[PDB]
Every structure is written in C-alpha cells, then in structure tokens.
Amino acid sequence: GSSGSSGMPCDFPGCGRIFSNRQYLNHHKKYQHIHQKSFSCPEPACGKSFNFKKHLKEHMKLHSDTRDYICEFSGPSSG
Ligand SMILES: [Zn+2]
Numbered sequence: 001g002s003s004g005s006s007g008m009p010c011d012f013p014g015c016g017r018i019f020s021n022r023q024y025l026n027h028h029k030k031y032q033h034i035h036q037k038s039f040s041c042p043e044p045a046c047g048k049s050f051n052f053k054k055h056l057k058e059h060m061k062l063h064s065d066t067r068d069y070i071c072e073f074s075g076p077s078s079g
C-alpha cells in the first residue's frame with residue numbers, strides 16, 4: 001500500500017463499484033445497499049450465507065474440523 005489508487009471502490013465484494021467523490025459512495029451504499037449488510041462463507045464450495053454475525057462464527061466451527069497446512073509440496077513457495 002505504498003500509494004493510493006484513483007476513485008473509491010465500494011465495500012461489497014460482488015458490487016465492485018467505484019466513485020471519485022466519497023459523498024457519492026456513501027449515498028450509493030445508503031441507496032443501493034440501503035438494505036442490511038450480510039455475511040458470506042469464505043468457502044467457495046460452501047457458498048453459505050448468514051444474516052447474523054453469531055451464525056457465521058458458529059458455522060465456521062464445523063469447517064474447523066478440517067485442518068490444513070499453509071505450506072505444501074505440490075506448490076513450493078519461492079521468493
Ligand atoms: Zn456498492
């Protein structure tokens with residue numbers, strides 16, 4: 001994050017909107033995203049969603065069951 005970028009991107013991931021002036025952004029979120037924010041699962045295959053913060057947390061619990069290592073042979077990290 002050495003330097004910033006032009007325009008101001010939206011918060012929502014799917015949205016993918018950009019607005020030069022901030023005023024517009026806030027208005028866009030208050031208008032388009034007027035609705036209440038939501039929580040999505042960080043898993044692609046899961047594609048689950050929860051309208052409650054607690055729900056997401058508890059949901060993850062299950063996933064936890066499966067553990068993994070940041071490092072792997074298949075893809076040797078270099079640099
Ligand atoms: Zn947006």
Ligand SMILES: [Zn+2]
Pocket residue numbers: 041042043046047048059060063
């Ligand atoms: Zn999930």
